Amino acid sequence: GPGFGGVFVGSFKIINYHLATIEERQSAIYVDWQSDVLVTPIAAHGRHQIARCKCNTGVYYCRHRDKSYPVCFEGPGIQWIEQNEYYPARYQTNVLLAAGPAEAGDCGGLLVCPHGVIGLLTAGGGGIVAFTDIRNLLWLDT
């Protein structure tokens, strides 16, 4: 809803690995440390949908500025080995690169296109923001 709490699809919840808790990690149904994402069952009716598109443009929420920024990002590739306050020097998978304001506190924001959510905000800074594509997880049905 607000846009800073992960994705809630059906009875499942999607969040970043660096922002997850131990209980969620233990009960998670899918995890990708390289992509920095978890998928764990959640007892709720999700009102979100995953984008089954190839959109190259979208809008993301900047929590530390509390504003919506549109941006045209690059496709899902593997990115530079950088080290954060959470992580060691490593390269991430399914990374969408775009230009825009970002901060350490905004980790977890939502990127949306008309079809739905595309990815979560992994990290950003210095005018460059990187997201984790989640389009490969659109199990809306079973």
Please identify, among the stretches 72-80, 88-96, 112-120, 121-129, the one whose residues bind Zn ion according to the rule CB under 5 A: 112-120
- Of the residues 19, 31, 55, 59, which one makes contact with Zn ion according to CB under 5 A: 55
* Gap between the Cα atoms of 78 and 69, Å rounded: 24
- H or E element that contains 23: helix 22-27
Task: Please give the size of the binding site for Zn ion, defined by CB under 5 A.
Answer: 5
Amino acid identity, residue 135? R
Binding of residue 53 to Zn ion (CB under 5 A): yes
List the alpha helices (DSSP H) in 44-91. Answer: none
What are the structure tokens assigned to 21, written together? 């808790």
What are the structure tokens assigned to 15, written together? 């969040």
- H or E element that contains 107: none
Q: Pick between residue 27 and residue 68 the one whose CB is nearest to Zn ion.
A: 68
Binding of residue 51 to Zn ion (CB under 5 A): yes
* Gap between the Cα atoms of 47 and 45, Å rounded: 7
Please identify, among the stretches 10-18, 29-37, 54-62, 96-104, the one whose residues bind Zn ion according to the rule CB under 5 A: 54-62
Assess contact for 30 and 38: CB atoms under 8 A.
Answer: yes
- Of the residues 34, 93, 115, 138, which one makes contact with Zn ion according to CB under 5 A: 115
53 has binding-site annotation:
yes
Q: How many residues does the chain have?
A: 142
Binding of residue 138 to Zn ion (CB under 5 A): no
Q: Which parts of this chain interact with Zn ion (CB under 5 A)?
A: 51, 53, 55, 113, 115
Q: Which residues are annotated as a binding site?
A: 53, 55, 113, 115
Residues making up the annotated binding site for Zn(2+) are: 53, 55, 113, 115
